[PDB]
Amino acid sequence: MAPSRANTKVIVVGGGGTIGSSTALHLVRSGYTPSNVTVLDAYPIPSSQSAGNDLNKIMDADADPAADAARQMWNEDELFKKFFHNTGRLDCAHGEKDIADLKKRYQNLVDWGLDATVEWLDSEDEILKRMPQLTRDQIKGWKAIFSKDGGWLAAAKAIKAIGEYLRDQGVRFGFYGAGSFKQPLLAEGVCIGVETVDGTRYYADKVVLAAGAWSPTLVELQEQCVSKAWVYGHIQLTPEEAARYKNSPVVYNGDVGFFFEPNEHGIIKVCDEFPGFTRFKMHQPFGAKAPKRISVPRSHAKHPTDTIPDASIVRIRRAIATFMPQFKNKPLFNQAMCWCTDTADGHLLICEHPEWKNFYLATGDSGDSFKLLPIIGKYVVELLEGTLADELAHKWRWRPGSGDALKSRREAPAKDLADMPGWNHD
Ligand SMILES: *Cc1cc2c(cc1C)nc1c(=O)[nH]c(=O)nc-1n2C[C@H](O)[C@H](O)[C@H](O)COP(=O)(O)OP(=O)(O)OC[C@H]1O[C@@H](n2cnc3c(N)ncnc32)[C@H](O)[C@@H]1O
């Protein structure tokens, strides 16, 4: 019957990204033999097109079991702890609608699962006493929640640290044409390996597809996942300017955008807040009988001259003019699109393929899974071994026809890059 952990060969497709690197880590921590694990990625770990290849991501206070288990590891696991910056978060709102919603969010913590960590800031001057770097004339009528819990995650560094640990263990890697998945290798309905674009054939007992936004492009997912991009750009502070924002909280206003503490090189990343962009084109995933119109990521790693739409730049410039008016003349550089894939309900897609035995999906990240990096591979290993909790097996199940992922649980259906000029410089 089935091999032991030490004798099981596993291929992790997308193992240079978030879910895939975590899966490879948890296979080695679980006592799989490192040389029996093969990481395949289009790009070397940390993949240059991974959504986790970022200077920073937010760590919030999500009460979910996966998020809580990840939070404990960001605080306690020596591989990850140094990459969690506990700056806290300043969530601001203005206008009657946004303030009323913020006030209810705050009350839902008092009423329910404790505040302790959280403060209501009921005026401009209370926001300024927390964050003196803001400008009063730009925050007229604002209120905020200040949370001391959470902060930001040094995302690319964390995936790089997993990759170094995996290399030092003796995990096997294939990248570029030797890593770019083309198709599963099927033998009478059982997946026994993968073929890459260069024609290399890798054989294993189990295959994990952790290909992020590329997952519905690579195999037929029946629109369960729809891929979308979000945007950012960067500004460079002088050492004196950057020292003002040492340990600064993540600052967010849902009408405006958000920005992070400068990194150790003085760079602040600034983001819009919006429902994402698709990039529909004709493509034929493995298991599709003909080409289909699907959202296919427009990869900045493949197209490094790409930037972001003009509309996005206007929004990011508005966010800088509002949060950091003293920096409005700094150029916005290293502008990029970053891709995720939404399910209709925003829950993960972590399941065995219904026809291809031993081929597992680990995707549906839905734009909020970087914080799960330390833990998510544990659940994927449980899935491979048949021990995943039944409630999670159901929540993460194969579910075509379960709702429109174009809108997902977001405010609107995503707009398409074909309609949003300014990002293509070919
Ligand atoms: C884009 C984005 C995401 C994001 C965010 C802001 C932006 C702009 N803010 C976040 C935040 O504050 N907090 C948080 O927890 N998450 C946030 N996110 C979302 C997060 O980045 C994603 O949910 C998560 O990183 C997705 O992980 P996943 O593992 O699913 O995807 P990935 O890291 O992109 O990795 C996919 C890998 O697949 C490889 N690939 C693609 N095609 C192939 C082929 N053909 N063969 C082999 N490998 C392939 C990619 O190269 C990549 O490494």
Three-state SS sequence of the chain: CCCCHHHCCEEEECCCCHHHHHHHHHHHHCCCCHHHEEEEECCCCCCCCCCCCCCCEEECCCCCHHHHHHHHHHHHCCCCHHHEECCCEEEEECCHHHHHHHHHHHHHHHHCCCCCCEEEECCHHHHHHHCCCCCHHHCCCCEEEEECCCEEECHHHHHHHHHHHHHHHCCEEEEHHHCCEEEEEEECCEEEEEEECCCCEEECCEEEECCHHHHHHHECCCCCCEEEEEEEEEEECCHHHHHCCCCCCEEEECCCEEECCCCCCCEEEEECCCCCEECEEEECCECCCCCEEEECCCCCCCCCCCCCCHHHHHHHHHHHHHHCHHHCCCCCEEEEEEEEEECCCCCCEEEECCCCECEEEEECCCCCCHHHHHHHHHHHHHHHHCCCCHHHHHHCCCCCCCCCCCCCCCCCCCEEHHHCCCCCCC
Q: Same structural domain for residues 351 and 310?
A: no
Query: Is 181 near ligand 1, meaning CB less than 6 Å away?
Result: yes
Residues 196 and 35: their CA atoms lie apart, in Å, by 19
Please state, in angstroms and rounded to a whole number, the distance separating the CA atoms of residues 415 and 345: 19
Q: How was this structure determined?
A: X-ray
My answer on whether 310 and 265 are in the same domain is: yes
PDB resolution in Å: 1.4
Separation CA 210–CA 321 (nearest Å):
38
As given in the structure block, the two tokens for residue 100 are 């009323």
Same domain, 317 and 373: no
Ligand 1 proximity of 212 Cβ (cutoff 6 Å)? yes
155 in the same domain as 41: yes
The reply to whether 129 and 200 lie within a common domain is no
Q: Tell me which residue has its CA closest to atom 28 in ligand 1.
A: 212
- Specify whether 396 is located in the same domain as 307: no
Single-letter amino acid code for the residue at 9: K
Tell how far the Cα of 364 is from the centroid of ligand 1, in angstroms.
Answer: 10
What does each C-alpha distance from 63 to 112, 115, 157 come to in angstroms? Answer: 11, 13, 25
**18-29 and 373-385 helices, crossing angle to 10°:** 60
Q: Is 327 buried (19+), middle (13-18) or exposed (0-12) by CB count in 10 A?
A: middle
Which of these, 263, 271, 299, 256, lies nearest to 423 by C-alpha position?
299
Q: How many domains does the chain have?
A: 2
Decide: 370 in ligand 1 pocket, CB within 6 A. Answer: yes
Same domain flag for 290 and 328: yes
Residues 166 and 58 in one domain: yes
Q: Which amino acid residue places its CA nearest to atom 35 of ligand 1?
A: 17
The answer on 145 and 109 residing in a single domain is yes
* Cα dist from 235 to 148, 203, 268, 333, whole Å: 25, 46, 5, 6
Q: Among 323, 325, 329, which residue's Cα sits nearest to residue 270?
A: 323
Instruction: Quote the domain boundaries for residue 210.
Output: 1-85+150-225+344-403
CA of 188 from ligand 1 middle (Å) equals 32
- Residues in Cβ contact with 265 at an 8 Å cutoff, skipping those fewer than 6 apart: none
Beta bridge partners of 283: 292
- Could you tell me if 210 and 275 lie in one domain? no
Q: Answer yes or no: do 278 and 144 share one domain.
A: yes
Closest ligand 1 atom number to CA of residue 51 = 34
- Decide: 343 in ligand 1 pocket, CB within 6 A: no
- Determine if residue 236 is left, alpha or beta; phi over 0 gives left, psi from -120 to 50 gives alpha, anything else beta: beta
Alpha-carbon distance 255 to 318, whole Å?
A: 10
Residue 314 neighbours by CB under 8 Å, 6+ apart: none
33 and 68 inside one domain? yes
| Cα(365) to centroid(ligand 1), Å | 8
Nearest-CA residue for ligand 1 atom 1 is: 338
- Would you tell me how many other CB atoms lie within 10 Å of the CB of residue 235? 23
